[PDB]
Assembly symmetry: D2
Homo-oligomer: 331 residues x 4
């Protein structure tokens, strides 16, 4: 017969069900950065890519497949049709609406809701037990949208939130102190972007609190302008976009880190976006970044960080704003 039949003797015709499947939605720069980072960390036995642009999609898939020899992820698949995403343990959403000049913020968000209205039900249909990881911006709001539309319990809908911002923060701390980011500890919480909260009290190296050694840390009396470091974190995003057009690599790595905690059930603590109703006097259905314990069931626990009245107020303000927008959305 065929060569295959002359060479290989088959013992078992069984249809495969993947054990550790991950799906990435959106094959723009961010999606592809997430994909490659995941592939290089051996987190999945099957990777699925979905987008609306069929050509780009197929091309990215082929490019990855050609590298199979150098990978340990035996199956990479793609398609416009969400059936290819079946049985994902984790689905990462990077797709969004592309911005129009002169469009209001509310309008942009609504257009994303309309996109998610197509995406989410299709995801849930084929992977009813998956965890959702939302990366698209604005992340805290779109994580809420995905939660609402999916009908999943809140532990299973996760926003990337301030994971990357905290990583940037630690990198910058490390630059100033001459130590690796891994050994600098610091937390950025709340709303992703301009209104994030740097928790000065918690900043340390080897368990030595910086605020104790330098009490003006994070104030304006601060002659070393540490307050600037936080501003720098917020600005660096735009700085990079101004320079190369967009951001990709850092987000990809940050997302893969989250995926690792989930796929391996590590129960590490990450500053990620979860529903916060009932904490710090927040009474609305909003998602904000707090330190969360992350594992195979998504977010199981939250760490209660002790905040100053100023910081606590800053969070409530963010919650009010987010709710203000969310209440205006048409589902």
């Amino acid at each position: 017969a065929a060569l295959k039949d002359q060479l290989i003797h088959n013992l078992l015709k069984e249809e495969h069900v993947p054990q550790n499947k991950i799906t990435v939605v959106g094959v723009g720069a961010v999606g592809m950065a997430c994909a490659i980072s995941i592939l290089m960390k051996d987190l999945a036995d099957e990777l699925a890519l979905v987008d609306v642009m069929e050509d780009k999609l197929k091309g990215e898939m082929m490019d990855l497949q050609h590298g199979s020899l150098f990978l340990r992820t035996p199956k990479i698949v793609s398609g416009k049709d969400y059936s290819v995403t079946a049985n994902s343990k984790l689905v990462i959403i990077t797709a969004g609406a592309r911005q129009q000049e002169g469009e209001s913020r509310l309008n942009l968000v609504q257009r994303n809701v309309n996109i998610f209205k197509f995406i989410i039900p299709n995801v849930v249909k084929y992977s009813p037990h998956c965890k959702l990881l939302v990366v698209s911006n604005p992340v805290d709001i779109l994580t809420y949208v995905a939660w609402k539309i999916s009908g999943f319990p809140k532990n299973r809908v996760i926003g990337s939130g301030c994971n990357l911002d905290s990583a940037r923060f630690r990198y910058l701390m490390g630059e100033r102190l001459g130590v690796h980011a891994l050994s600098c500890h610091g937390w950025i919480l709340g709303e992703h972007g301009d209104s994030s909260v740097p928790v000065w009290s918690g900043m340390n190296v080897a368990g030595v609190s910086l605020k104790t050694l330098h009490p003006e840390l994070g104030t304006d009396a601060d002659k070393e302008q540490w307050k600037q470091v936080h501003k720098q974190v917020v600005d660096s995003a735009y700085e990079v976009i101004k320079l190369k057009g967009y951001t990709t690599w850092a987000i990809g790595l940050s997302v893969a880190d989250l995926a690792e905690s989930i796929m391996k059930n590590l129960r590490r603590v990450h500053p990620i976006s979860t529903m916060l109703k009932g904490l710090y006097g927040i009474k609305e259905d909003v998602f904000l970044s707090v330190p969360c314990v992350l594992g195979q069931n998504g977010i199981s626990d939250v760490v209660k960080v002790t905040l100053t009245s100023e910081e606590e107020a800053h969070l409530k303000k963010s919650a009010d704003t987010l709710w203000g927008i969310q209440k205006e959305l048409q589902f």
Copy 2:
């Protein structure tokens, strides 16, 4: 009174001299794919990026730096000035001229020569003991150019050649046979691109020669059209460019694989482009892909593959053509 001084007691203001530095020249899609793949394989303690576009360069560097928390490569640097590349063990060249519409092959190469005339001397100036790995196309010719201009001994100038083409080939074999690419063996040699030579005799799984089981393999009498698989490997590159605009990920992975053999002195055999004068009756200064042993000093040995008179002639033809062009170049 400064915080750093209150926290850290310094023992040494030592000079950074990096031990395992890698430089990537060119921060287009291919360059950046090489960079990220290298970063994720912990091959270097310092990575340098060089290009002519300062904005793009700086942006890519920052994006990578922001991910330092998730990496184990403590120093990432960039610049227009080649001084930032000093003391590289390995320098990867991805820069080049893009071909223009209806442009003659000789003309295209000459334009690249002019670019390399600036790049190579600067590289050699700051890293006189490095190995050069050329990725730019056309790779066999440009590897020759780099060799000529660098004045390095031939063991230290390496072209990526048919490394990726062979990897694509094995992937496709694996698809047809239902086994991983890792367990399919096959070699594509000679000139990179449409005139590559698939060595049918050497194709095997578990040491079982396919040509023995299916004697018409690779001919036109072949009713399974295995000859098509080779055509497919050649077409793949264009197929992907047509679909997504360019090729990146697979090259990045293939290059990182080569970097691994070099940085860790593995002495694995790869189908890569080396100077072949003196083999298969080739008497000209030409580079073509043959199976090479790759280690810390570059290419130390070559494996003498037994070729049919047809295959051998095909190689000589390629050598003649390449020399025909090379002899016309203005250095």
Copy 3:
């Protein structure tokens, strides 16, 4: 309340089931080598250790747990009771009886049967869907025993067979040729130990068959004594025992390699022990090493290697001997 309650806010109550659990039976040197190799390759989210010696068991567990900071396997457990092995995807058996002076082959095997009669039913009880990987010697026979007692279908009972022997063989060929073992290809098949079959025809580097370049390869006319290399592979085990008392590291690495193919569904080809009834004119229920495709469902396919009449006869001889013993066993 407690500190834990003041610090952590719980969102989700539930007792969890591990997704990628591996169990190792036997915590002698071989078992522990398998364990450490598996832990360092991030193959499992939970690792279970079982043995009869409760002290040694608990001590090994604790020692490993203390290293959890440096690992990515969050749960390590142990116990005399097999309930701790529940929900394993893969169970690796290293326990067994050591042969006595003057003791017949049949007697040795029977003593192991008696041990397996306790182990296997307990394993299958708590992990009815697992794959069994038998490492204990004599491996081909004990793999049969485990199959018989488990009542599992044959694709799911795997013997480590000649995986390590082939790896040793490639290492030795690499030493002689000056290339890495990864680039030397060679297969040792059949019965593990002194009756193994080195398949000379299939030995190659870069697809160049050594038998073609050196037709006396593997004969006694062979002035380079390649036949000795195979003898060396057989003797290696004893050589190492004579020197350091026992063997561990290489087996551990070889087993982890198999585990990787299974846990990641790679469908790589390994020379491992599977039931061969129906191949090479073998009509009995025996296990021998042949090249097998290994994936998430165990052994799905076998590669039909073309053997010389001598080689084929050698296999049949081994099958006859094994059956001779197996038919006498008391279950």
Copy 4:
């Protein structure tokens, strides 16, 4: 002539000089655990093993070599003669004298000095630029001995100190809180063993100080007995020795972690043993564990942890005792 010559065409006869060589001294359980951990983390391109027991040494080497296919460290060597250790970047010392019953502390140390008087000069002779990492106990004293005998500057002589003790501590914290050890932070400082200092003030999760939430933490008024966790860390070593006879795995992993920081120049902070004269009012030449920044030149910086008068006194006491012994030693 030979098959090798018919198959491989040599282009380069060069001398091998390893780029990232590591030597382990002592092939007892601890040494071998360090070796395997290092091999599995791809930290070296050459690994050397040295001990006085030639048989055990050779056997361990061979066992490792047989696994070469599954490793990416191409050269593993061993010998009684220290010439095999030439050009090591890092030398790890695990050899030492085993205690005799009723032998005084001073006597035991002196016997180790006599051993180190043979080892260290030989190490320094062949690898004059290496860093020394001392693991043997008592580590703080023997690190001093090695420093004295080597004549190296102090940044290059490192004791493993409380690295593992801190790792155990974090594991136990994690067990109590239901979070991974990676996300629990805590430091054990000073003299390795019974007199270590747990720094309660610095203990945190996500930057939330436990001492702030539970002010009696670490006292006897502490109804949760956190003080016990420290006792547990000290006892666990003996507990494991009672159970298995010795400790191996955790030390091996801890050491490999340090090796990673050194070989990759990460500048992470570890609690390791360095010379402390001039800090906390210590005026003698003694080594104790404090948080050190670790990189390619060894210890570049030390973090000044803020200590209570009790803690500070505890350290001075330890310094006095160590000096008491050190001043009696015959070099």
